[PDB]
Amino acid sequence: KDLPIHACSYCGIHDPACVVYCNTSKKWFCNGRGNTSGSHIVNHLVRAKCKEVTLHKDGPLGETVLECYNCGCRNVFLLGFIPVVVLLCRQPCASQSSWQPLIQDRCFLSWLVKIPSEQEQLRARQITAQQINKLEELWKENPSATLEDEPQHVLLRYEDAYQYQNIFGPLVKLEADYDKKLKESQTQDNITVRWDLGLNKKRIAYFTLPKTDSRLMQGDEICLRYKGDLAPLWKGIGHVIKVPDNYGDEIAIELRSSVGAPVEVTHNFQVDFVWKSTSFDRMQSALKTFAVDETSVSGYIYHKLLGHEVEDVIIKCQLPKRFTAQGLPDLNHSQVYAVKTVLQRPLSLIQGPPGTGKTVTSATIVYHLARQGNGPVLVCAPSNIAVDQLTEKIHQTGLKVVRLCAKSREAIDSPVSFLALHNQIRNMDSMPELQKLQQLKDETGELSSADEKRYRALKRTAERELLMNADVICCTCVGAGDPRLAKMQFRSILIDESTQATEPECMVPVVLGAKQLILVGDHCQLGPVVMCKKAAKAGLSQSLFERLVVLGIRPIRLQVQYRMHPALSAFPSNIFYEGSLQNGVTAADRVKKGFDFQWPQPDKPMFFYVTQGQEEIASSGTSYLNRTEAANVEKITTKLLKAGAKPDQIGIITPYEGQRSYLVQYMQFSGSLHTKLYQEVEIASVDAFQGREKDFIILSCVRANEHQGIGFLNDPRRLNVALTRARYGVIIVGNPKALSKQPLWNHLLNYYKEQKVLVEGPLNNLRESLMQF
Numbered sequence: 116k117d118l119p120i121h122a123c124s125y126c127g128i129h130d131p132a133c134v135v136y137c138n139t140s141k142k143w144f145c146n147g148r149g150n151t152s153g154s155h156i157v158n159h160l161v162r163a164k165c166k167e168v169t170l171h172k173d174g175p176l177g178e179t180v181l182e183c184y185n186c187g188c189r190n191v192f193l194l195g196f197i198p199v200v201v202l203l204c205r206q207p208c209a210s211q212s213s214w215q216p217l218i219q220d221r222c223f224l225s226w227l228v229k230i231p232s233e234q235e236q237l238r239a240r241q242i243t244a245q246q247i248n249k250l251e252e253l254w255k256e257n258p259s260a261t262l263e264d265e266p267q268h269v270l271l272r273y274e275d276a277y278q279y280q281n282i283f284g285p286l287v288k289l290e291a292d293y294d295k296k297l298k299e300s301q302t303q304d305n306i307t308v309r310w311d312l313g314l315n316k317k318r319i320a321y322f323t324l325p326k327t328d329s330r331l332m333q334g335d336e337i338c339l340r341y342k343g344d345l346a347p348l349w350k351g352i353g354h355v356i357k358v359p360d361n362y363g364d365e366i367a368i369e370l371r372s373s374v375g376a377p378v379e380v381t382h383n384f385q386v387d388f389v390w391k392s393t394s395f396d397r398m399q400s401a402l403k404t405f406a407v408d409e410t411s412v413s414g415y416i417y418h419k420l421l422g423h424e425v426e427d428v429i430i431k432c433q434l435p436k437r438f439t440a441q442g443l444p445d446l447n448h449s450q451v452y453a454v455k456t457v458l459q460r461p462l463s464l465i466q467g468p469p470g471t472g473k474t475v476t477s478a479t480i481v482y483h484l485a486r487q488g489n490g491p492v493l494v495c496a497p498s499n500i501a502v503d504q505l506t507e508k509i510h511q512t513g514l515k516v517v518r519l520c521a522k523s524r525e526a527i528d529s530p531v532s533f534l535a536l537h538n539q540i541r542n543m544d545s546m547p548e549l550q551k552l553q554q555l556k557d558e559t560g561e562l563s564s565a566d567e568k569r570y571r572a573l574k575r576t577a578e579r580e581l582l583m584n585a586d587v588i589c590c591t592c593v594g595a596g597d598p599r600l601a602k603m604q605f606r607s608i609l610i611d612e613s614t615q616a617t618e619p620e621c622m623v624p625v626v627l628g629a630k631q632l633i634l635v636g637d638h639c640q641l642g643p644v645v646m647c648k649k650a651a652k653a654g655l656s657q658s659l660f661e662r663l664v665v666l667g668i669r670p671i672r673l674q675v676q677y678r679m680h681p682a683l684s685a686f687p688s689n690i691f692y693e694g695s696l697q698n699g700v701t702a703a704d705r706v707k708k709g710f711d712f713q714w715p716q717p718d719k720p721m722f723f724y725v726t727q728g729q730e731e732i733a734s735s736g737t738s739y740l741n742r743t744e745a746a747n748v749e750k751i752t753t754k755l756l757k758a759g760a761k762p763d764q765i766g767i768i769t770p771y772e773g774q775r776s777y778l779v780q781y782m783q784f785s786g787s788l789h790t791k792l793y794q795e796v797e798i799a800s801v802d803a804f805q806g807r808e809k810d811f812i813i814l815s816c817v818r819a820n821e822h823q824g825i826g827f828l829n830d831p832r833r834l835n836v837a838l839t840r841a842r843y844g845v846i847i848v849g850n851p852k853a854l855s856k857q858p859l860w861n862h863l864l865n866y867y868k869e870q871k872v873l874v875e876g877p878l879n880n881l882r883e884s885l886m887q888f
């Protein structure tokens with residue numbers, strides 16, 4: 116929804132008491148001066164060459180054309196009051212033969228047209244006098260135009276949410292367009308399908324694509340077309356329920372509609388990846404409302420987000436007697452500090468380094484916010500796993516939590532699916548008619564118009580009730596722009612993994628009425644992914660959290676790590692956290708009991724295992740693999756399991772789909788242990804381990820030739836995530852020469868070598884490598 120029709124055509128102000136409608140130009144202007152020395156009407160009347168004026172319906176005087184009571188002269192520069200008061204022309208009507216100027220000090224009398232307060236004007240578009248000239252110069256022959264007549268780089272500080280929209284807006288468009296072409300380039304042509312039937316009795320299609328790195332996500336939408344000649348032309352939409360993983364390389368989709376699926380036929384399918392504008396629209400719209408709607412975020416948040424100087428404000432509030440939340444672990448001192456500081460200000464950042472209890476700290480905050488009783492607390496993060504991790508912790512506190520997701524993500528199971536709004540509505544025994552309708556619906560996918568109408572009516576009632584009555588609503592950043600949440604307000608908002616969102620993404624939940632906003636994350640960890648290189652270079656890949664940091668806002672840092680053996684945290688702490696991370700567990704706490712595995716350096720549970728075999732490209736696709744390297748990864752995996760580790764306590768991180776896929780196949784084929792044990796060893800790229808941990812982590816670097824690389828190979832931040840998932844042991848497998856083409860990896864290899872932990876030869880008889888860097 117735009118500005119009201121009575122919005123000042125210059126700065127946006129739309130308080131009916133402060134506006135003046137210009138009869139010739141048919142436009143409204145405000146009685147405030149803003150950036151110039153003189154009001155916005157007066158400045159306009161002068162340059163547009165006008166004099167005739169009508170006041171607003173809801174104004175001190177009502178909807179009336181200003182004119183002299185004597186002669187009806189409508190010239191405002193000639194009008195004025197004589198003292199029980201009369202409006203008269205200075206000459207000759209004020210002349211005693213038949214005084215106060217109406218315009219005085221370059222604007223209208225305050226008690227006929229009110230002057231907007233500083234706040235309103237400080238919130239309006241900051242239009243300069245030199246900008247008025249040019250804008251007013253264009254209206255001359257184009258009364259339609261506005262101020263907008265290689266993309267402009269992101270800034271630290273913004274005059275305006277309007278300037279803000281104008282800078283990020285075109286960045287979002289570059290991303291959306293890029294993404295559309297990307298998605299559309301992905302079409303696969305000669306595809307073989309395996310058909311199946313879920314227990315929910317929906318139709319499922321399995322198929323295998325070339326091996327690619329980009330990624331495909333559960334709940335993504337795929338258009339499956341039959342194009343063979345064993346039958347006729349058929350098209351179906353489905354949503355991804357399986358990506359290639361430890362159970363094999365197949366992608367699986369669940370069809371929306373069961374009906375008419377060509378189950379009998381197998382060859383000649385075409386796979387298209389449906390693009391939707393939704394997330395970009397929601398981003399564009401959040402920019403719009405950030406500019407246009409002054410109730411969408413508080414004055415404080417508004418000025419703070421835009422890089423203005425604001426005096427500190429203490430949020431009034433009753434502190435809990437105890438900061439630790441029921442259901443959750445006792446907080447340490449720095450976490451207690453974070454919770455208490457954060458509750459007492461309108462805006463905060465919290466930095467949660469690996470192993471420091473970011474998630475528990477966020478859940479505890481949310482918990483106290485929810486008990487202050489201001490309606491549902493809004494909680495977001497940029498990714499589905501990070502929302503789910505947060506949802507789960509918050510649930511431990513005993514609060515009513517609703518997890519909201521897209522209708523496309525509905526087929527997806529997670530540990531928190533039982534909390535999903537669509538599942539909760541399904542269990543509403545207070546609503547039998549809705550339940551009956553929902554049964555009917557679960558035979559086809561669809562309903563009759565009279566019933567689909569009824570069902571939508573009831574489903575809306577059911578969604579209002581669970582959403583309005585929740586203590587906490589968890590959803591994705593982009594998901595906060597869901598139409599089911601519009602018409603709701605959220606005064607308290609916590610965004611975790613905010614360091615993974617672009618500014619526009621982050622702002623989507625922000626504009627839903629923020630009065631208190633907490634951004635949690637870690638800018639030394641995962642950042643936003645921006646596919647469009649132009650957009651990237653203009654700044655889009657800088658999260659909101661990062662910009663506020665560079666702007667000089669100090670994040671409260673969580674200080675104690677409880678995950679890692681001290682030897683494992685040393686290097687990331689020294690590199691990313693200026694050696695400030697404190698160890699909450701000892702070396703002794705982090706020696707696995709009866710785990711008889713021989714570390715090269717027995718008291719340092721890490722090593723870099725040198726291999727220098729050749730990388731190759733996948734036989735089907737464009738990703739990389741390393742066969743030498745994979746054999747070694749299995750041997751290590753097998754040693755760890757034989758020494759006492761359990762498959763779910765081990766993770767393998769590699770940047771390439773080629774290597775992931777090869778590793779699963781290789782272990783199933785050549786692993787000496789029972790095949791299923793390997794199936795339970797998670798192999799994936801670094802994204803899938805965010806917020807998660809294992810006892811042991813193996814990295815498989817893959818590349819043996821100098822390269823740009825992807826994931827942890829050329830992003831120090833992803834390397835930081837890779838090095839901090841393990842509690843007990845980290846093993847890196849790879850080729851040092853290929854990797855030392857990197858300041859960081861260079862430092863990592865020097866470090867490991869000084870630590871005597873850069874090694875070669877058979878696992879049974881490891882020697883220190885003689886290479887140097």
Ligand SMILES: [Zn+2]
Nearest residue numbers: 123126145155
């Ligand atoms: Zn104005």
Ligand SMILES: [Zn+2]
Nearest residue numbers: 137140163165
């Ligand atoms: Zn005019």
Ligand SMILES: [Zn+2]
Nearest residue numbers: 183186204208
């Ligand atoms: Zn007159």
